[PDB]
Each structure stands twice: as structure tokens, then as C-alpha cells.
Amino acid sequence: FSIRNQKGEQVFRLAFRSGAHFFIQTVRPKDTVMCYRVRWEEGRAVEHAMFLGDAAAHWYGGAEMRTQHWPIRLDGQQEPQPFVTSDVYSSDAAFGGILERYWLSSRAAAIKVNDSVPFHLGWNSTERSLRLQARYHDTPYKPPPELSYRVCVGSDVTSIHKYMVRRYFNKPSRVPAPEAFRDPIWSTWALYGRAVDQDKVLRFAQQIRLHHFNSSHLEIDDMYTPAYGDFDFDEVKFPNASDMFRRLRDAGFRVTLWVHPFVNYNSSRFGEGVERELFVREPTGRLPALVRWWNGIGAVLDFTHPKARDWFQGHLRRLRSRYSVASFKFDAGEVSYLPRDFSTYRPLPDPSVWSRRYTEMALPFFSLAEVRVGYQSQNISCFFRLVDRDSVWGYDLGLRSLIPAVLTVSMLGYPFILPDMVGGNAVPQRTAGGDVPERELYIRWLEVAAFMPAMQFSIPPWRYDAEVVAIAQKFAALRASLVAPLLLELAGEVTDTGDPIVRPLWWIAPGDETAHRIDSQFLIGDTLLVAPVLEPGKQERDVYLPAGKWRSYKGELFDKTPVLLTDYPVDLDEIAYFTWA
Amino acid sequence: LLDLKAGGFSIRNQKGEQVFRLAFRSGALDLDSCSRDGALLGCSLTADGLPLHFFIQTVRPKDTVMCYRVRWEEAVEHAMFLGDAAAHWYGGAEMRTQHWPIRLDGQQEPQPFVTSDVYSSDAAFGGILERYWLSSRAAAIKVNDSVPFHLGWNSTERSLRLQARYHDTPYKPPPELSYRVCVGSDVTSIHKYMVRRYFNKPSRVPAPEAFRDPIWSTWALYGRAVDQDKVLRFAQQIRLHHFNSSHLEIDDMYTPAYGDFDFDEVKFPNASDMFRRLRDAGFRVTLWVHPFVNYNSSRFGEGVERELFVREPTGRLPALVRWWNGIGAVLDFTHPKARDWFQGHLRRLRSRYSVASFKFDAGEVSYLPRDFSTYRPLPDPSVWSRRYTEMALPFFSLAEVRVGYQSQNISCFFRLVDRDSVWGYDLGLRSLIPAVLTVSMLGYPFILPDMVGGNAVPQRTAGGDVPERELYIRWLEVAAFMPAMQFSIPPWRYDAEVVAIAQKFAALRASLVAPLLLELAGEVTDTGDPIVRPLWWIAPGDETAHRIDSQFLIGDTLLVAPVLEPGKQERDVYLPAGKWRSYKGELFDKTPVLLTDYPVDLDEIAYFTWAS
Ligand SMILES: *[C@@H]1O[C@H](CO)[C@@H](O[C@@H]2O[C@H](CO)[C@@H](O[C@@H]3O[C@H](CO[C@H]4O[C@H](CO)[C@@H](O)[C@H](O)[C@@H]4O)[C@@H](O)[C@H](O)[C@@H]3O)[C@H](O)[C@H]2NC(C)=O)[C@H](O)[C@H]1NC(C)=O
Ligand SMILES: *[C@@H]1O[C@H](CO)[C@@H](O[C@@H]2O[C@H](CO)[C@@H](O)[C@H](O)[C@H]2NC(C)=O)[C@H](O)[C@H]1NC(C)=O
Ligand SMILES: *[C@@H]1O[C@H](CO)[C@@H](O[C@@H]2O[C@H](CO)[C@@H](O)[C@H](O)[C@H]2NC(C)=O)[C@H](O)[C@H]1NC(C)=O
Ligand SMILES: *[C@@H]1O[C@H](CO)[C@@H](O[C@@H]2O[C@H](CO)[C@@H](O)[C@H](O)[C@H]2NC(C)=O)[C@H](O)[C@H]1NC(C)=O
Ligand SMILES: *[C@@H]1O[C@H](CO)[C@@H](O)[C@H](O)[C@H]1NC(C)=O
Ligand SMILES: *[C@@H]1O[C@H](CO)[C@@H](O)[C@H](O)[C@H]1NC(C)=O
Ligand SMILES: *[C@@H]1O[C@H](CO)[C@@H](O)[C@H](O)[C@H]1NC(C)=O
Ligand SMILES: *[C@@H]1O[C@H](CO)[C@@H](O)[C@H](O)[C@H]1NC(C)=O
Ligand SMILES: *[C@@H]1O[C@H](CO)[C@@H](O)[C@H](O)[C@H]1NC(C)=O
């Protein structure tokens, strides 16, 4: 079938690919919105092919991906694979920790695949299609096959988007700590890695103050515990944790701790987990299932089990009372780390609801919590971190990935976004510059990061030179005076409007074909327009201003719009931004 | 002599008797689709119209033997009818409730025919089994090793439900139901043909002393709480009461955790000194071992990182398993690294402590996960049980195992699954002869009928703490006539008369039974014949011999008739054709005959030596 709008244009086209209980129910929820409920139910896979269309048609949403484009680009052929929370760090086939079955068109069509579907997603570049599949074979989906979805058609991309988000996604009711929207977060992970210890945390805190930076908080990362699954400090690397936390308090540092859902087989807590039955089980529901993650082999906690939830929460509360820790970084949470076939205390026909149940563990510590997964987690009022970025320039987890990823996550109704580490994680063989991100990549990244809801340093500015430190202090000051006040105001609006903080250009210019295509610019609310340099050896870039009057950061009033500003000057130590007038 | 129809077939012998009948239960044939080319009869279509690879190939391997190869490939089910009351069947699996001949009780949906622990289940199949059924009418069936074979039964129509399926089963693909039905002149000749065709004979013989002197086990006496003091007290008490020993078997638990191989120093302060003392008192010693490593073993981490364990289906991670001693992984005996690793630890215990051999406990695939992967794929999961039994090969002379899956050529002892201190066919005294004969049918000659008096499990013990005095005495007497004899709860736990009865049967075993067991053990390599034989072995045309579950032979010449009922000082004794000299010197030369109310005191067993 195919669908048109009131103006007569074809906005949606779909081919049946399993063959030629089916229904299409038309609904008129508003004078300007037309929705089409669709079902195909016959034991053999259902597949429908959704055509993106004639390249003037641009699409947004779906999953956080390793290679994030905006609008969405289909590369090659992909057989339908489970649309579930996966770790996308090392896979361009899989789908990332934050996703919904939601696709939005610039032609003002949108599709929400029904939550019931055992949903698998593939694609075909040749015919430019999304391959929408329901199946129960070779998949972590369990029965409780049906492909069911709703296609809606509005007047423009922004109105139809707002209708869909208000229909399907819950807004958060609370706001993270104000300081997290202004002062940089400092993380041990990229700087020190696993080898972090009591000396290194204190040296870091000293160096942060010596170079005159504020902190939202200091985040002590992997690894501070004797084994993965233990909750208390390794006394070899942390001789007197209490004294460490006292010193950090004296220097005005709030502190968070890296946590995860795993208990390795050589944790002092593994036996306790087995005997108390706190772990995700093999299919028969009798025994723990072993899992492999990047930090070894063990079990994973069952967050559908009240005993496992209270047990995890108990250890977090103890770290809080013992050390005055503010909150936690909840790492992993993807079901790609659960077994293919598993059982839990409450059955999960949809495995990704496990990811949701993990994100619930942040609720009691939400104010300075971060998670890196979201599956209908929008009403959890903590920060959502993009999956670990690499110290490269490109769309593959690099600098050019930041704006597509942040916008994608914003489309899915998560306002409080943390675009991971300034300069990336500096992984050997995945670092433009060898040991650390090259100076120019670090500077351009820092500048984009200064305009996002939360800013996190690991490799600090003073690792480079005094000019890089000066650039950092400049953008820290600019963030405090211009960006932070707006982020907080927009953060406070979310409860009422459900609108995101970081917005695509097309948000205010929904009928603008150029705004539909832009992946190099973004808005903070409707009034701040940001155009970072995202290419090396460049001291200028083309800047698109949509309809309306815009006052440049230099005081230039642009009142003949829309217009492309060609070779607009932007020095290494500058970012192009424009305020609505 | 085969009669094929749409919905099943039947077979007759040269004399004209129907000796085999089978119904197709996953469909019927289209007979217009059947064509005969010499020996081969092939059919290409079901009655429903489904395409089918079905055939029956007749083979004449000998003047007196006629075989019928059968295949059905499109879940496949055929119902094999046992027939009228006059037709008696033997073989299949060791079972919780063992009858002889085989009795079908109630309705059973086909379930995987795999090595299971039948201690607590009357549905499952035991550690020793083959897909082999033998009829008193001289028909036999061997189900093809290829089949993903599931077995059920139906009492109403008295049928075995033979099923091939790949759904809800530990069988993996590499469904086809394939088998061979053979017909001979008598039950013994057709049995001998089938055993020689399908089962390898062992080429070696266990230590002579194991066929004569009692084995002493710590398990039933002390259980888990066994320690260095208790082993030495036991050894002292064995010598104080003037008994020989094949060996002393130190059982569960002597290690700090399950998966560790060395002695718990809390319970065994100086193991070396313990073994020295046992050597000084002329004790050979064996140690209880198992295929598991619990999660709290000091060897669990080593197993995970070295990938020595049976894995979950994706083949990446160990699969956790539950056994009666806790939760952990199970060693992959298809993996050379896991085999060398296990063998390494056994060799170290040998050189360190001069241990003679090991009791290899568990070994059933009911302790592996439903769905698993191994270093080498096992379409048939029970081959894992076989690979475990191979670990006995280097220590075969005083080794025992309690599983067998084409393990016949491993020249160690095979132990019946743990017996209970009850009288009945449910792992009790009356189970001993059916079980030993069943295991003998499957070509395992060196059989150990577990512990004299059973394992004394609370709530499963006629007598409370220990087996009743009378049950213990009657059991000891029948156990004295089996290939290997094992005490745990010793005679001196009762009274001086029980000790005297033990010394009498120990002496009788040494002078009468042991010389015959050794001679018959030495014959196996040549003849492939078992040691313990059913009455019908020498009397294959004797309808009474076909039915007897209360008597057995040692070879062809020693006939044994124990009392298997409480408060009895007599029993009926059937003597088949030939002359028999009673243990009292009575010549019975008018046979076959039923000896009615034949006197057997509490301290006696009825036995008869061939005199023809
Ligand atoms: C004790 O008894 C065992 C059987 O009860 C003996 O092992 C069996 O021996 C026979 C004859 O050697 C084997 O049958 C053969 O298999 C070989 C090897 O096949 C392998 O490769 C194929 C690849 O196509 C694979 O599918 C198989 O699974 C094997 O990995 C074939 O090449 C021959 O043609 C023939 O079919 C049995 O495989 C084997 N069974 C088991 C369960 O081990 C054992 O040798 C006896 N001991 C002694 C000392 O003789
Ligand atoms: C979306 O999913 C829900 C749940 O699968 C569907 O609602 C069910 O409809 C089935 C049969 O169509 C009924 O048997 C259930 O009782 C319904 N449950 C509820 C909660 O209403 C719904 O129909 C699906 N939408 C479409 C368009 O197929
Ligand atoms: C936060 O949103 C989640 C997800 O929408 C809510 O959980 C769902 O709520 C509905 C309505 O009660 C239930 O029927 C669903 O089963 C829930 N789904 C899951 C995956 O949990 C949750 O209630 C919201 N929180 C609050 C406080 O309203
Ligand atoms: C067990 O065997 C009995 C006897 O053959 C089966 O009962 C008959 O089933 C047939 C086929 O459906 C009916 O036509 C008869 O009327 C049934 N009753 C009789 C003859 O007893 C029974 O189906 C078998 N059950 C199982 C579970 O195999
Ligand atoms: C714990 O186990 C991991 C594998 O899960 C292993 O690599 C590591 O070295 C072990 N470390 C400790 C401290 O036991
Ligand atoms: C640093 O913190 C102080 C105290 O809260 C605040 O007044 C100031 O604006 C901050 N400066 C920054 C972020 O540059
Ligand atoms: C028995 O199995 C083998 C291997 O699958 C097969 O080639 C043979 O034909 C089977 N026998 C019969 C009678 O089907
Ligand atoms: C064990 O006992 C013997 C004799 O008492 C002695 O020679 C040996 O040194 C002892 N060793 C240990 C470690 O107890
Ligand atoms: C014990 O062993 C000796 C010597 O090995 C043997 O001659 C004797 O028959 C055995 N039996 C008894 C009951 O003493």
C-alpha cells in the first residue's frame, strides 16, 4: 500500500514481503493528523519493506548506531536482526543502547512499530527500504508471529513528530543537578583506565583546581574494586578510601562511582548471587546463565527480580552513607550481554525491557546519575550518555558522529544528553594522534561539547599546552554565561512541553529542505543556533541560517534569510553561534 | 516370511509362529508406491500423499538367522507389539524398577533414550543401556545408532513406542527411524548373534582379588562426614573381624570442595600417613571421583579460562549444571585438554598416595544441560557418558563406573545405580537379579550390584537407621554369588551371628564362586559371553526359564536360588533339564522339575552344581 497527504504528495509506501488476520484502521485524532493502524497475523516470519522514497524524503530516529548519519543513510544489504539494546562500540550491524521503533520523515510521515511485535530490522540500499520483520526463530524474543504498526501523516515534520512523541514517549518530571548543566564533569576512565588508584584520583583533583576549573563532580571509573561484582574499594590501590573522599570534599568535589550489572565468577559476591538466585537464568529457569562482557566472565543481575533489585540498591546506599558518594555511572545495560536464550523472575517477551529495569536503578540517585541505555526509559530524570566515542574525526563514533547521535537521542524524547568524553576515549589503533587525540581534534571536539547539555573531560586540557587550557577556560566561561542559563530553562520546560533541549534546524524550519539535510548544525531550544568546525585544517565553514533574523556571536545582524553564509570565518579557538532576533 | 501392510508389518519364523508385529503411528504407506527389487522392498509415498524414503531389506547372514533392515524418513513413531503373554522380552535400559522379563506399567509418552540418574525417577532410563530388545520367541531388534531415539510404551496394547524427533530433546542433527529385526532358532542363539554383531567384548580382566575378596566402601557407613580417623577405624575393624579386602574405597567427601582433587587437611591431617597405615594392614585403596567442578572449587576458574567444561549452545561459555552435591560446570570428555587435565590429577593421586584406581561416580547426560555444545559435536548426547567411561581405561584393574554407552570394551567393573535398603523391585533386593541379568544382556560381564543391604537412605530403609537384620542377611547371601561383592554397613553393625554368616559366605565365595567367576572372566575375550546368565541361557526352549526372575546361573554349571522374601525359611526352586547336585548333596535327575517348599534357613542360600 501507499499513503498521500491533503496536498496530494506520496508520503509513505510499503511492500508485503512474506506474501500478498490483516487490517488497516484509519483514525482522525486531529483536523491535521491522519493515522493508519496496520496488522498482519497468520508459524513463519512476517516481513514488510518500508520505502524511504525519492531522496528529497529524509528520515530520522531509530537506534543510536556506531556510524550515525543525519538524516539516516542505509549502507549495503542487512538481513533483519533483533532490534534490541546492543553494545555498538565494535559493530555497524547491531543497534545501540538507546532506541525506539520510531522513524520520522521530512515529508511529515511517521511510523511507530507496535511494542507487541518480536521486531527485527534490516535494510536494502538498492530500493532504499527498511526491512520490518516479526519472527520467533533465532532471536532473544520469547512468545507471551504478528507485525503491527501505526503510520501517521501531519502538515509538517515538527507537528507530526510532536504528535508521535506525546503519544508514545513519557516525559521526565524531574531535572538533574543544575551544576551538571554548567560545570565540566571529570572522569578517570580515558586518562588512567583500569590502573586508576587513590594517588591518581587525588593528583587529578589537584590538577583540576591548579588549572582553575569548576567541577559538577569527579567520576571514579573502572577499576576501584578487588574483582568485578564486589562493591567496596580495593585496599591495595585505595589504602584509605575514607581519607581520599575527605580530601575531595575539602577541595569542593562531589563524587560519583562507576557500577555495572555483572558479578564475575571470582567475585566474593558470586556465590551469594547463585544461592540467592539474583542472576538471569538459562532457559529452564533453574540455574544462573554465564555471560561474557569486556571485563570477563560471570553472571548478570536479574532486574525483574525484587530480591536482586533490593540487593543492588542496598550496595549503592552503603557506598552513599559510607563515602558520601552523590550518585553512580551505570555502565553496560545492553541485552547483547545477556544470553541469546534466557529466563528471568518475570518473563520478558521483549528482552530490552531488561535494559529498562536496569535504568530504574538510577531513579533513587537520579540527580547526578548517568546511564548509556534507554528502552522506554524517558521518564527516568537522569543523564543519558552516548556509547563510548573514539578519538577520530568521522561519523564512526568520531567528532562528526556527535551531532547526529545527540539529535537521534533527542528525537527519542531523552532531553538530558551527555555526548561522552571530550576528544573520545583514546583507544590504541582508534586514535587520530596515537597516545591521545591530536591537538586540533581535541580543540574542535571541546568547542562542540561546550554547547551540549552536559560536558565531560577525561584527558584534560593541560595534557596539550597553555593555549588549549586557555581555549578550555574560554568555553567554560562562555558555557557559564550563555549556554548553561538556556539549558537549565529548557530542562525546566521538559515536564510541561515534553520538548528536547538539543533540536535539529528543521524544528523551527520544518518546511525547509536544507534544514532537513543539515548534520553540522543544531539548536539549543529555538533561539541558539550552533555551527562548529568539524574538519581539520579549516579556519572557516559554510553556515546555513534558516528563516528569521539571527545575531552572530560577533554582533552581525543577518536579516536576509534563509541564506548560506559561505566561508564564514571560525578560528581554531572559535565556534560560530547565532541568537534569534 | 514378512507380511507388509499399509498401517504396519508382521514377521513369522520357519515353524510358522508370529515372532514380531509393528504398527506405523506417524502415518500409513501407499502400497501402489511400493516396488520389490530382489531383497529390497521400497515405498516412496505415505497414504496422506507425503513423499517418503521407506524400505525393508531382507538379509540371510547365516543358515538359521534372517534379518530385516527397516527405514522410515519423510517426528517418526512406530509401535512394536511385545505380543501374547507367552512372549517375554529382555534388554533395553537399567531402570529404577527392574523386572525380568520386562513389564510395561501404564502410559509413557516417548522420552529421550539417554543415560539418566534413575535413583528418583521411574520415567527415565538408567546409566547402562542399549537400543536392544530380545524376545523368548527368538526375535530381536537393534535400533540404528543414527536415530535421535526416544522410547515410550503403552500397557493396554503392550507396545514399545519407538520415536525419532529433533524437537524438545538433547539430540542434535548432524527425523529418521531405522532398525534391524533378526529372527533365529532360539532366544540364546539369536541373542549371541545380536551381541556379536553390535557390542565389543572387553579384552582384559579386573584384578583377581575383586572377584573373591569383599570391597569395603565408606559411603553408606559414614557418608559425607568420612575422615582420616573413620577410614583407619574401619580398616582396623575389618581386620579385627578376620575379613580379606579386594580394596578399601574412600567415598564422598575427602576434598575441600567438589572439583578439587587433593585431601581436605581438616578431615585428613596427614593423608600420606593414613595411606602408609592402610598399606601396612595390606589394604589396596581406591578414591571416589566425578566429572563436576563446583563454582566454589579452587579449580573452577582454571576450568573456565582453559575451556575444559561443557558449554551453552553458542559454544562460547561454560554451562552451569546441578547435581546432588551442588552447582558448577561438568568436564567435556570430548576435549583432549579436559581429558589430559582430569587424567593428570588421577595420575598425581596414584604416584603421591599409591592409590590403585578410582570409583567414577555420575556420568549420566541427565546432569548435562538439555541443550549444550562440546569440543567435538555429539548428535547422540550419551556418547559423552562413553567418553567419561574412557577415563577408567588407564586404571581399569580396580576401576568401577555406573554408566555404559557402547562402553563394553572397557575392562573395568560396572556398578548398578545406588540400591535402596528395601525388599522390592524398586532398587531393592528383588531388583538385584533383573538388573544384573539386564546389564549381562548388554554385554557387560564384570557387574557390581552396589552395596550389601543398600545405601540406608532415611525414609527409603526397611529398618530405620540401617537395613533390617533379615534384609541385610538375605542380600549378603545373593551378593556373595555375583561377580563383585561390596560391603559398606559391615556385618558387626548387627551381631556375632550376622558376622558368622558373612565369614561363611566369604569362605564359600572363595572356595566355590570365585574360581568359577575368574574362569568365566578369562573366557569373555574368546566367547563374548557374560558371567551371570539367565536360566533360559542353557534352557532356551523352556517357557518356565523365560519367566524366572528369582534364579540365575554363574556360567552354565552353577544355579543360584536365593530367598527374596521376609519371614521365609523355604522357597519354590525351578531346575531345568539336566542333572543338578544341591548344596546339601541331593542329586536331582528327574528334570525339569519345580522343587516346592525347598528348605532354605536364614543363614543358607539354595545353589545346585551341574552333574549331567
Ligand atoms: C571400543 O568400542 C568403541 C565403539 O563401541 C570403539 O570406537 C568406535 O569404533 C568404530 C570403529 O573405529 C567407530 O566407527 C568408525 O568411525 C570412524 C571415524 O569416524 C570419525 O569421522 C567421521 C567423519 O565423517 C565422524 O562423523 C565420526 O563421528 C568420527 O569422528 C570412521 O572413519 C569409520 O568408517 C567408522 O564408521 C566409532 O566412531 C567409534 N564409536 C565411538 C562411540 O567411539 C573403540 O575403538 C573400541 N576400542 C578399541 C580399543 O577398539
Ligand atoms: C498492538 O499490540 C496490542 C497487543 O498485541 C494489540 O491489542 C490486542 O489485540 C489482540 C488481537 O488483535 C487482542 O486479542 C488483545 O486482547 C488486544 N490487547 C489489548 C491490550 O488491547 C493491538 O491490536 C496491536 N495493534 C494493532 C494495530 O494490531
Ligand atoms: C515510566 O514509563 C514507563 C514506560 O512507559 C511506565 O511503565 C509502563 O507503564 C504502563 C502503565 O502503567 C504499564 O502498563 C507498562 O507495563 C509499563 N511498562 C514497563 C516496560 O515498565 C512507568 O509506569 C512510568 N513511570 C511512572 C512513574 O509513571
Ligand atoms: C494405547 O493403546 C490403546 C489401544 O490400542 C489406544 O486406544 C485406542 O486408540 C485408537 C486410536 O485412536 C481408538 O480407535 C480406540 O478406540 C482406542 N481404545 C482402545 C482400543 O483402547 C491408545 O490410543 C494408546 N494410547 C497411547 C497414549 O499410545
Ligand atoms: C578474575 O577473573 C577474570 C576472568 O573473569 C580473570 O581474567 C582475572 O585475572 C581474575 N582476577 C582476580 C583478581 O581474581
Ligand atoms: C564556578 O562556580 C561558581 C560558584 O558556584 C560560580 O559562581 C561560577 O559561575 C562558576 N564558573 C564557571 C563555570 O566558569
Ligand atoms: C543406519 O544408519 C546409517 C547411518 O545413518 C545409514 O547409512 C543406514 O542406512 C542406516 N540403516 C538403515 C537400515 O536404515
Ligand atoms: C606425616 O606423618 C609422618 C609420620 O608421623 C611424618 O614422617 C611426616 O613428616 C608427616 N607429614 C606431615 C606434613 O604431617
Ligand atoms: C584371603 O586371602 C588368602 C591369601 O590371599 C586366601 O588364600 C584366602 O582364601 C582368602 N579368604 C579368607 C576368607 O580368608
Could you give the CA distance from residue B102 to residue B6 in angstroms, rounded to a whole number?
A: 29
| Cα separation, B485 vs B452, whole angstroms | 8
Smallest Cβ–Cβ distance between A265 and the set B300, B314, B316 belongs to B300
**C-beta atoms of A271 and B295 within 8 A:** yes
Asked if residue B456 lies in contact with residue B464, where contact means CB atoms within 8 angstroms, the answer is no
Phi, psi of B586 (to 5 degrees): -70, 125
Alpha carbon distances (Å) from B210 to B128, B145, B477: 21, 33, 17
Helices (H) and strands (E) in chain A, counts: 12, 31
Amino acid identity for residue B469 in this structure: R
* Three cell numbers, residue B12: 513369522
Residues of B with CB under 8 A from a CB of A: 295-296, 300-301, 304, 312-314, 316-322, 327, 369-371
Catalytic residues of B: 361, 364, 426
Chain A residues lying within 8 Å of B307, measured CB to CB: none
Rounded Cα distance, B385 and B130, in Å: 13
Query: Entry resolution in angstroms?
Result: 2.4
Return d(Cα A375, Cα B13) in angstroms, integer: 71
Q: Which of A183, A221, A302, A334 is catalytic?
A: A334
Q: Starting from the CA of residue B275, give the closest ligand.
A: 8
- Give the gap in angstroms from C-alpha B26 to the nearest C-alpha of chain A: 21
Residue A564 phi/psi, 5° resolution?
-90, 115
Q: How far apart are CA B385 and CA B364, in angstroms?
A: 6
CA of B218 to nearest chain A CA: how many angstroms apart? 29
**Quick check: B378 and B169 in contact, CB under 8 A?**
no
Burial of B192 (0-12, 13-18, 19+ CB in 10 A): middle
Check: CB of residue A274 under 8 Å from CB of residue B296.
no
Residue given cell 541373542 in the structure block: B191
Instruction: Tell me the C-alpha distance between A146 and A136, whole Å.
Output: 10
Catalytic: A31?
no
Pick B301's closest partner by Cβ from A265, A291, A292: A265
| Cβ–Cβ < 8 Å for B569, B587 | no
> Which residue among B304, B321, B369 sits closest to A297, beta carbon to beta carbon?
B304
The three grid cell numbers given for residue A33, joined into one nine-digit string: 493528523
Strand B139-143 versus strand B107-112 pairing type? unpaired
Q: Would strands A262-264 and A296-300 be described as parallel, antiparallel, or unpaired?
A: antiparallel
Collapsing DSSP states into helix, strand and coil, what is residue A569? strand
Cβ separation A290–B322 shorter than 8 A: no
Residue closest via CA to ligand 3's atom 27 equals A379
Pocket test for ligand 5, best of A224, A225, A263, A264 (most atoms within 8 A of CB): A264
For residue B545 the three cell numbers come to 526359564
Q: Among the atoms of ligand 5, which is closest to the Cα of residue A265?
A: 5
Whether the CB-CB separation of A437 and A145 falls below 8 Å is answered with no
CA distance B137 to B143: 19
Beta carbons of B131 and B382 less than 8 angstroms apart: no
Residue A77: count of CB within 10 angstroms of its CB: 11
CA distances from A372 to A283, A407, B572 (A): 27, 15, 80
Task: Judge if the beta carbon of residue B178 lies within 6 A of ligand 7.
Answer: yes
Gyration radius (Cα) of chain A, Å: 24
Query: DSSP letter string over A75-118?
Result: -SEEEEEE-S----TT-SSS--SBEEEEEEETTSEEEEE-TTS-
| Contact assessment for residue A131 and residue A80, using Cβ atoms and an 8 Å cutoff | yes
Q: Would you say the CB of residue B35 lies under 6 angstroms from ligand 8?
A: no
Length of chain B: 612
Experimental technique for the deposited model: X-ray
Rounded distance, CA B420 to CA B462, Å? 9
Query: Environment class of residue A219 by beta-carbon count within 10 Å: exposed (0-12), middle (13-18) or buried (19+)?
Result: buried
Q: Residue A369 phi/psi, 5° resolution? A: -75, 150
User: How far is B162 from B493, CA to CA, in rounded Å?
Assistant: 48
Helix locations, A36-187, DSSP H: 157-168
CA A294 to chain CA centroid, Å, is 20
Q: Which ligand is nearest to the CA of A378?
A: 3
Q: Cβ(A124)–Cβ(A99) under 8 Å?
A: no
Which cell numbers in the block locate residue B606? Answer: 539354595
Find the angle CA(A143)-CA(A145)-CA(A150) to the nearest 5 degrees: 110
Q: Beta partners for B404?
A: B128
Beta strand B285-289 pairing with B552-554: unpaired
Q: Which of A282, A396, A535, A540 is catalytic?
A: A396
Kindly report the protein residue whose alpha carbon is nearest to atom 38 of ligand 1.
B383
Alpha-carbon distances, residue B444 vs B202, B527, B557 (angstroms)? 8, 13, 20
Main-chain dihedrals φ then ψ at residue A453, nearest 5 degrees: -55, -40
Would you tell me how many other CB atoms lie within 10 Å of the CB of residue B241? 14
Nearest partner of A424 among A383, A393, A382, judged by Cα: A393
Sign of CA dihedral A448, A451, A453, A456: positive
With a 6 Å cutoff on the Cβ, whether B109 touches ligand 4 is no
Residue with cell 555471560: A291
User: Rounded to whole angstroms, how far apart are CA atoms A280 and A340?
Assistant: 12
Regarding the beta carbon of A357 and ligand 3, being less than 6 Å apart is answered no
Residue A208: CB within 6 Å of ligand 3? no
Ligand 6 contacts (CB < 6 A) are A 182-183, 214, 476-477, 480
A294 close to B320: Cβ distance less than 8 angstroms: no
C-alpha cell at A137: 526463530
Q: How many CA atoms lie within 13 A of B138 on its CB side?
A: 24
Closest CA to A58 of A73, A44, A36: A73
* A287 chain-B contacts, CB cut-off 8 A: 320-322, 327
Query: Residue A55 has which C-alpha cell?
Result: 531522496
For residue B612 and ligand 4, the question of a CB distance below 6 A is answered with no
Taking the C-alpha atoms of residue B434 and residue B128, their distance in angstroms, rounded to an integer, is 13
CA A309 and chain centroid, separation? 24
Rounded distance, CA A491 to CA A174, Å? 9
Under 8 Å between Cβ of B483 and B521: yes
Q: Which helix (H) or strand (E) holds A241?
A: helix A241-250
How far, in Å, from the CA of A358 to the mean position of ligand 3?
Answer: 14
Q: For a ligand 6 pocket test, name from A212, A214, A473, A487 the mutation site with the most ligand atoms within 8 angstroms of its C-beta.
A: A214
Q: Is residue A493 annotated as a catalytic residue, yes or no? A: no
Provide the greatest CA pair distance for chain A. 72
Question: Which listed ligand is nearest to B377 at the C-alpha?
Answer: 1
- Asked if B430 and B465 touch (Cβ cutoff 8 Å), the reply is no
Residue B466 CA to residue B448 CA, distance in Å, equals 21
Tell me the one-letter amino acid at B430: R
Burial B582-608 (b: 16+ CB within 10 A, else e): bbeeeebeeeeeebeebebebebbbbb
* Residues whose CB is less than 8 angstroms from the CB of residue B173 and which lie 6 or more positions away in sequence, other chains included: B148, B166, B379
A302 is catalytic: no
Pocket test for ligand 9, best of B242, B244, B284, B505 (most atoms within 8 A of CB): B244
Distances (CA, A) of B167 to A193, A281, B71, B150: 48, 21, 20, 11
